[PDB]
Amino acid sequence: VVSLAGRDLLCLQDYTAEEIWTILETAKMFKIWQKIGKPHRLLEGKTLAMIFQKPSTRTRVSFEVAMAHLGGHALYLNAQDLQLRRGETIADTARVLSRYVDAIMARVYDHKDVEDLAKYATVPVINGLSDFSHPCQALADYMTIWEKKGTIKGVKVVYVGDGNNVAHSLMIAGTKLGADVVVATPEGYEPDEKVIKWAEQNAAESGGSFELLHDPVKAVKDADVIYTDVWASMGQEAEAEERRKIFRPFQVNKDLVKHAKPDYMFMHCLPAHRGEEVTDDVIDSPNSVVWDQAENRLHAQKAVLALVMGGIK
Amino acid sequence: VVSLAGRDLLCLQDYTAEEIWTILETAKMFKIWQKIGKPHRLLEGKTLAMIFQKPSTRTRVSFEVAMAHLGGHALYLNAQDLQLRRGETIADTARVLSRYVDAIMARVYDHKDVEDLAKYATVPVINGLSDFSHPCQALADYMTIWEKKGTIKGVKVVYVGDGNNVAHSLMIAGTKLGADVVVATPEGYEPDEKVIKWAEQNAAESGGSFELLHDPVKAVKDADVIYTDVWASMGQEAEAEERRKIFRPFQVNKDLVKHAKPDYMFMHCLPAHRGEEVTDDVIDSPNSVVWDQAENRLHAQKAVLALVMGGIK
Amino acid sequence: VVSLAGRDLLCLQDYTAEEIWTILETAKMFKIWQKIGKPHRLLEGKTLAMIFQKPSTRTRVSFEVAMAHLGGHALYLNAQDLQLRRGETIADTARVLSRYVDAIMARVYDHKDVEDLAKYATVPVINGLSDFSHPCQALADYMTIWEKKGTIKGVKVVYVGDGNNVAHSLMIAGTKLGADVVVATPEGYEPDEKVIKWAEQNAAESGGSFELLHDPVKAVKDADVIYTDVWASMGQEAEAEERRKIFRPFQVNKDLVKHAKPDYMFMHCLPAHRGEEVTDDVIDSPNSVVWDQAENRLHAQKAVLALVMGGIK
Amino acid sequence: VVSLAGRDLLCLQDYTAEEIWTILETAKMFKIWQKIGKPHRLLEGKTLAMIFQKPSTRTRVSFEVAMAHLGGHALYLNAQDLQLRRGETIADTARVLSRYVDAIMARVYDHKDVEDLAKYATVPVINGLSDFSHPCQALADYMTIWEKKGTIKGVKVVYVGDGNNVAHSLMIAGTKLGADVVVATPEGYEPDEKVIKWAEQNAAESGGSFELLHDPVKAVKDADVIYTDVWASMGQEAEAEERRKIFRPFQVNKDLVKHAKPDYMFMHCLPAHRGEEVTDDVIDSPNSVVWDQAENRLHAQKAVLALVMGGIK
Amino acid sequence: VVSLAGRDLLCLQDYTAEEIWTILETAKMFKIWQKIGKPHRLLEGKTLAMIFQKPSTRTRVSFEVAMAHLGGHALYLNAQDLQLRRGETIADTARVLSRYVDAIMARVYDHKDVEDLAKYATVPVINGLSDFSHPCQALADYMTIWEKKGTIKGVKVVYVGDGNNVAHSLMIAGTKLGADVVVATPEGYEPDEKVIKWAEQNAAESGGSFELLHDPVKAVKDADVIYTDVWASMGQEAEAEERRKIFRPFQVNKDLVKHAKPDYMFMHCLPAHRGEEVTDDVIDSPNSVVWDQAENRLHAQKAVLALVMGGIK
Amino acid sequence: VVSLAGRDLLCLQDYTAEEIWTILETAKMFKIWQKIGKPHRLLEGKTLAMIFQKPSTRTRVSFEVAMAHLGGHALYLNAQDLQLRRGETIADTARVLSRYVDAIMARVYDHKDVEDLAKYATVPVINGLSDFSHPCQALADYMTIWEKKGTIKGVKVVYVGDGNNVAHSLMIAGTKLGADVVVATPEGYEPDEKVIKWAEQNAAESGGSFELLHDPVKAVKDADVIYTDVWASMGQEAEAEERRKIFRPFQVNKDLVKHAKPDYMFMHCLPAHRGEEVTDDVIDSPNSVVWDQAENRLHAQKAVLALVMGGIK
DSSP states (O other): OOOOTTOOBSOGGGSOHHHHHHHHHHHHHHHHHHHHTOOOOTTTTOEEEEEESSOOSHHHHHHHHHHHHTTSEEEEEEGGGSTTTTTOOHHHHHHHHTTTOSEEEEEOSSHHHHHHHHHHOSSOEEEEEOSSOOHHHHHHHHHHHHHHHSOOTTOEEEEESOOOHHHHHHHHHHHHTTOEEEEEOOTTOOOOHHHHHHHHHHHHHHTOEEEEESOHHHHTTTOSEEEEOOOOOSSTTSSSSHHHHHHGGGOBOHHHHHTSOTTOEEEEOSOOOBTTTBOHHHHTSTTBOHHHHHHHHHHHHHHHHHHHHHSOO | OOOOTTOOBSOGGGSOHHHHHHHHHHHHHHHHHHHHTOOOOTTTTOEEEEEESSOOSHHHHHHHHHHHHTTSEEEEEEGGGSTTTTTOOHHHHHHHHTTTOSEEEEEOSSHHHHHHHHHHOSSOEEEEEOSSOOHHHHHHHHHHHHHHHSOOTTOEEEEESOOOHHHHHHHHHHHHTTOEEEEEOOTTOOOOHHHHHHHHHHHHHHTOEEEEESOHHHHTTTOSEEEEOOOOOSSTTSSSSHHHHHHGGGOBOHHHHHTSOTTOEEEEOSOOOBTTTBOHHHHTSTTBOHHHHHHHHHHHHHHHHHHHHHSOO | OOOOTTOOBSOGGGSOHHHHHHHHHHHHHHHHHHHHTOOOOTTTTOEEEEEESSOOSHHHHHHHHHHHHTTSEEEEEEGGGSTTTTTOOHHHHHHHHTTTOSEEEEEOSSHHHHHHHHHHOSSOEEEEEOSSOOHHHHHHHHHHHHHHHSOOTTOEEEEESOOOHHHHHHHHHHHHTTOEEEEEOOTTOOOOHHHHHHHHHHHHHHTOEEEEESOHHHHTTTOSEEEEOOOOOSSTTSSSSHHHHHHGGGOBOHHHHHTSOTTOEEEEOSOOOBTTTBOHHHHTSTTBOHHHHHHHHHHHHHHHHHHHHHSOO | OOOOTTOOBSOGGGSOHHHHHHHHHHHHHHHHHHHHTOOOOTTTTOEEEEEESSOOSHHHHHHHHHHHHTTSEEEEEEGGGSTTTTTOOHHHHHHHHTTTOSEEEEEOSSHHHHHHHHHHOSSOEEEEEOSSOOHHHHHHHHHHHHHHHSOOTTOEEEEESOOOHHHHHHHHHHHHTTOEEEEEOOTTOOOOHHHHHHHHHHHHHHTOEEEEESOHHHHTTTOSEEEEOOOOOSSTTSSSSHHHHHHGGGOBOHHHHHTSOTTOEEEEOSOOOBTTTBOHHHHTSTTBOHHHHHHHHHHHHHHHHHHHHHSOO | OOOOTTOOBSOGGGSOHHHHHHHHHHHHHHHHHHHHTOOOOTTTTOEEEEEESSOOSHHHHHHHHHHHHTTSEEEEEEGGGSTTTTTOOHHHHHHHHTTTOSEEEEEOSSHHHHHHHHHHOSSOEEEEEOSSOOHHHHHHHHHHHHHHHSOOTTOEEEEESOOOHHHHHHHHHHHHTTOEEEEEOOTTOOOOHHHHHHHHHHHHHHTOEEEEESOHHHHTTTOSEEEEOOOOOSSTTSSSSHHHHHHGGGOBOHHHHHTSOTTOEEEEOSOOOBTTTBOHHHHTSTTBOHHHHHHHHHHHHHHHHHHHHHSOO | OOOOTTOOBSOGGGSOHHHHHHHHHHHHHHHHHHHHTOOOOTTTTOEEEEEESSOOSHHHHHHHHHHHHTTSEEEEEEGGGSTTTTTOOHHHHHHHHTTTOSEEEEEOSSHHHHHHHHHHOSSOEEEEEOSSOOHHHHHHHHHHHHHHHSOOTTOEEEEESOOOHHHHHHHHHHHHTTOEEEEEOOTTOOOOHHHHHHHHHHHHHHTOEEEEESOHHHHTTTOSEEEEOOOOOSSTTSSSSHHHHHHGGGOBOHHHHHTSOTTOEEEEOSOOOBTTTBOHHHHTSTTBOHHHHHHHHHHHHHHHHHHHHHSOO
16 A cells, blocks of 8 residues: 555546555445444545536535545535636636645546646545546446455456446556456447557556457456446437447347356446446346445545545645 | 334324324424533434425525534535436435435425335435425424424314415324314315325324314414415416415415414414415514424424434444 | 624624724634644534525635534525525525524625625624625735735735725725725726725724725835726626726736835735736736635634634623 | 645745744744643654754754654654664655654754755755754744844844854844844854845845944944854864954953843853853843743744644645 | 464564464554554553664664554663663663563664563563564565565565575565565575575475575566665675675666566665665666555554554453 | 652752652552553653763663653753753753753763752752762662562661662661661772761651661671662772772672571662672572562652652642
């Protein structure tokens, strides 16, 4: 384990495997404490500015609850309720916020927006979701995998669907930790090529592996985990059903699922569109872990906050 | 007194008289503690998700203050700010919320919405107001009556106006507790018939009484309390004044009030439309208790929260 | 120092110089405590209702953080989320809020709105900003001046720009404290005449001075501080550039700034419109103190809250 | 007051006047707390590595006591007892120490030695004395002057003797704070010319003044303070008495002292060589404040430590 | 995990693999606590006598800081400052110390000296370094390896240089824990043969392996870790350069390092002689972990102290 | 029991019997607390400057541990590490230390050195050993005697050897407390005559007795305690064995010991020169109490410190 004191969490590519394990180990300790009722108000008096540009259930309340458990206070700052709305620059709001709060979490459209937040703020900035990446989801995701499989190295983790922000994060964290990652998207809907190569260098160094297919049935074979997310809204069923015909073959159902190991984990970052990327029978299936995975957002983010705002100097 | 640990609070019809007295007795103890400055942070580290579909002053801040006094944290979740807005199912948000918070309070349009919340959540769900019922208002209301009259059994409690959600609750709680309830509405604007019969069975068992008139002046005679609420917005002064001509005779003023006992209590759940359901002279009158009644939302809800989230196992 | 227990803070004209110094001395003590890590949860269990009518970054999070540090809880109440939106009177919401919270801060358009809040509420009401005045900004502003110059009496404080709400407050506080205040606006854009005369009587009694010019270059000569704010939006570049041609000569840049003392302080209440009232080179200049000034909103407001809600009886 | 969190304290030239006042204000608060018995264990669990190259009474025990009062622990590390002695590089010991302690104080010969410590350590490094400067002594010194004169600006502070490390610090701090500093040395024994010019720019900006004489009787005229230190050991009474004949006219005695204001302060950083730089009759005189000045090393350094290690992040 | 209450720590050969894992698991828990700011003053009121015969940076301050964090107090006892210096027997000082302190740590020349300390003291005695072994360094070393590789069993750990005290400890701990250890020394400079055979029996039982080469380039092939230390001072470059010509081929540089796995760990117990056993480019290289390894002396020794003095009876 | 608040402890001759019993009673209470694990951090935040001129094991760590147990901090100040070394006067270091610490303990050669310390310091000064006396040893010694014999009055306490500092203290305390003291030295090596007469007046008043023999075998007859110390180093076996031939007949061995009561106590202040003043067989004998006697330095000094620094005003 190593210090993360003062660190931003924008993207996991600038994290070492040991830095990620630090978060996961701390998160497991916090989770056991939570189950046995041991208090841990480690950030008493501290505050987290939460800046939101979009509706949010998971990122919103997992961060807000995490600060409550840790004894501090999260501010829910809809960007529409700030002077950002009326023109104040990002740089200037990061600067003024830095004189009031101890960390900032942003849930933003453009990743450049939270990169600028980190650039100008003198406190840690956490990306709670951007169009480019979803690092706290990946932390939760691999926490869940570690918990259910006892390990991460060499487990076969397969994502099918739109190569988006959480696929990037799934890819990056998986390859830092040595897992065998495979991503299968409709032909023009793949992860950024910068991220694919990051994934490849990561696996090369970690001894894990990345693999980019286009046949979901091919991808999931003997999988330990099958992971999906909502389809590319972009081209919003264009004509009136183009979006469906290209993503629909990538839908996780009892047949697709048939091919993975019997003890496979069904994962989904949520929110899910039932009957689209996934069917009721899979997500509500005994093999689905989406509620445990969602819960781990709280424990992993509590770990992040304590580590970046708690290692104090 | 009996345990309420883990219970939902949707509608008071599924509460016994003793379960309601448990809330009122606990609420009086909390209120005295509050007046003498005795702290009672009994829910330290606990959190309450507050889901709101409508503007709110009383339900919003009485729940938010109650969690602060009890040492925990309420999250103000405008349903527009959640992924409910973008399609996530109620069932799925109740499920994910259950992995983060310790109770949920919903302020919703359709009662079925908070019944579904209760159905799918594994933590207690409290109806902070629905089109069908307003149980926390009734708890506050009969707390106030107990405080001013020293008792509830046999006091004559008269509601005039639109047979709506708070009339239902007024009716149900009153008849569970043995009071003599009478409700007088414009002829097509009466309480649900399911609730009237609930009221009748309740009074039959409690020894109290229910009575559904249509002459407000008739209703209020020798009343201990006269209660009203805003008129049925529905038919929003239709032509340009139909809403008024039918509800206006049911307006609480110095003349209507003339008929009740001299020491009668004027009650109103708020917000009030001055000059409509009630006149300045009555609501600002010495006989009005609307500010004490509004205050008791805080004390009764503090009692509810401590009892449903505090009886822990 | 004197008691401020129970006081409203609407406008500084009804404050004595000693009452203002009480806030500043308390604010400096809190700030040193904050820098050395000494906790001060002096308002545990207390709550602050924050009513907002406009977007806000500084007023919003400086009050919300201040309550967190003091151990209590601020409620963020967008007036659109309250029953104010649906017609409930100000008087009635002040009254009901008074039964739940321990103070109210309002960020409002019409000053009469927060005067009514104070009138009807039985708890202290703090104006967090109105069209008429910005008292908490002035407290922060003169805290900053005291800190950088070691004194306030006789320092020459020059405001250039639109004679608005924060100019009023700058004027009033400055003249209560004995400073030498000068305000320079485009010819029809001057402070209220009620406030100018308040300023004049204040300076007469404090031994400070007020002076209303119309030549910014004239105003700033040998200034200790140069202060500006956003231009009168009113007449929103009317034709397509009238707003600019009249306020633009009042823009703070390296040339205007040239004339003040070399060790002058550049101040701005924020948010700033870079390239309009001020240029990047001045605001980002070594002589600018806008981030220290913004920070002092937290310390001065913490002082206000502890003093008006803490002197308890 | 401003944050000093994480700062090194090598030389006061890189400190603003406000940063120095922050230390002095905090130091006065700590001193009053100490006199009234209010505990302040603000650095519990924290540790300070003290590296010493020379014998020390004042620097040694004022830092060691300061950490005890603050609840943490100072390590007394004679550089002869460390692996520095056996060849380990400064860079490498700063690096390893950084993984164990929370700050480092060094008492060193060559200033470059503590500059390197600061360069390579990731924790704050404090110069407890070097051949070039003695910043903690100057902080104590001007604390004492503020306490006895009520102010620093414009008091006339005169140093006579060898232009050494504490004269540098006396000069720099005095000119940052606006005092009127004059330094009088034997003709080849003056302060570094880098420091004299620093002093001159400082006074130019602060409005104070520096002045370098060579006639002690000239220097001390109407002085508020007369300050001396041990003579340049260098040339250790060379022949057998050269050191004396050049510094001896600069000896502070009842005659030299005659010329200063009657209420002048006699100061000396200690240790003193009685009968050399000063006579028993002056140092033990009612006008001497050397014991109060020495005491203020504890209070000012407690302020430094709490501020650089306490502003934690 | 098993109890270590009351145990001496002289040499790891008398420790089971499970007893070592007990220290490492406890050390990781303490380290996470330290990073998140959770206090753990588990030895309040307890004291550790530290007896030193040689200069020390790492052993000195890691033990002294560890007692501070744990709430107790380490005494720095240079053996020259004790009556040992003047003839008092080891047995008698162990005996008298036993009536005052709760544990003793010795940093000694002759291992027999700390064996006698353990023999006569009735409190635990910890070898902080002897000519024969350096057990606390090995604990730190394999903590670091566990942290960076996720495991110890089967990692290939290669030491090149003088077969000294820390090589012994590296060998013993590695073979207790199942690692694949190889040691390569100049031909007459190998580990004690008692220790080599201990290593061999250990590996036989643990399933790890030991191997004693004399070609560093041979040794390091595909290594997971390459470890070195300072050269045998003995024969202090005898003629004027004999020491160099025999140890210099065993110098860790970019070429030697070339042969190990790319993700190999460079380790060194410190202090290092740059340009001798190791070059700037390796030790300051991204693959070097010497600062993390040095840090783990604090965490592992905190674990030792809490376990041998905390398991109290 | 009486107050000792603020007192110096230089020599026991200026202590009353009741003042000594105050220390012993307090010491027994502290010792029982220590054995049962009852904490007693009575000097939290207080500090003790320990000034040492000689190597020390017992005085060093018994004082340093005593301050740790009491919650404060002892500073180990080797006089070589202070500016005493470089010429600063005793008076001036006592004076400066008085502004930092709360008591001073000195371990010095010349008693005049610690008398001067007491004279100039405004905090209590404790003689931890001087050439003239060893008062804390005597306190421990008679604590031990009280514990083993249940009383002190009338027990026969015999010292054989060099009439030195601890014999003085043995003599003085014994005669204040009513014991029957006899001292037997080689003919020119007797206690100071000032002390012998002090002893005689003391015994005259206490009803105890002093007696100065020169035949050790004569002295020890029917003794309750036999006490010795190291021989006069002075004349360091001059010729090559003169020191031995005169002190050697005064050596405590099984034959000398034969003559005392069977249940006699063998005492020695330590450190011992085995085979000189005492033989292995006596000191390691069941009748020896030197480890219990050494332990009581901690308990008696804890009593002293709490009483002279704790009786605060």
